[PDB]
Design a protein around this ligand. Structure first.
Ligand SMILES: COC(=O)N[C@H](C(=O)N[C@@H](C)CCC[C@@H](C=O)N(CCC(C)C)S(=O)(=O)c1ccc(N)cc1)C(c1ccccc1)c1ccccc1
Ligand SMILES: [Cl-]
Ligand SMILES: [Cl-]
Ligand SMILES: [Cl-]
Lengths: 99, 99
């Protein structure tokens, strides 16, 4: 699809068999989701935001479907204001910016 | 142009007679620039997200040139770790997400 930016570019994602709403975020290097259960082990990660840095849990090789496109990659879990799909998965789904 | 997301989508902007590098950020509601001077009236504002909130100065009706496309809009100025072009100005240059 082609998504304009007059409103937040919110899409439905599917992860662990559940639907969530998430923001397609070209400013985010990484995908970060609100607290949830994910399978497997996690590793520590620090990410920097507008307000400073936070600690998050890093899960690798996680299956996630984004606006109907399947991806398998790194998902960080922690105290984010909204679920955010970052460049690590935007590239998997073939997303570009155009003007 | 078509800008891929393999790397941060950084472009050159011109604002207040200064050339700067800024991030095209579909996740950002607002445009936020590192500390700089701008003409005219401003009011304080808090903007938030990952990490928490920061206080910024809000300047309205500011001329900006983004990757050679002229726009006008609100520019926030404050302690952001990176110059961000948000949706308020992305729309004006006709920027879309495509996949
Ligand atoms: C008054 O209105 C607001 O304050 N709106 C919020 C908003 O747009 N804020 C933007 C001006 C500023 C944050 C834009 C945002 C993404 O690239 N970031 C900046 C880019 C990095 C590289 C510096 S960020 O918050 O630091 C970030 C960093 C890393 C990662 N993985 C994800 C996000 C907005 C938000 C949108 C997206 C991410 C974080 C916050 C928000 C939503 C819900 C509740 C509170 C605030
Ligand atoms: Cl990944
Ligand atoms: Cl505006
Ligand atoms: Cl349009």
């Amino acid at each position: 699809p082609q998504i304009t930016l007059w409103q937040r570019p919110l899409v439905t994602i599917k992860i662990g068999g559940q639907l969530k709403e998430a923001l397609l975020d070209t400013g985010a290097d990484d995908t970060v989701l609100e607290e949830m259960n994910l399978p497997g082990r996690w590793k520590p990660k620090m990410i920097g935001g507008i307000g400073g840095f936070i600690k998050v849990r890093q899960y690798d090789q996680i299956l996630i479907e984004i606006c109907g496109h399947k991806a398998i990659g790194t998902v960080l879990v922690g105290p984010t204001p909204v679920n955010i799909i970052g460049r690590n998965l935007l590239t998997q789904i073939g997303c570009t910016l155009n003007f």
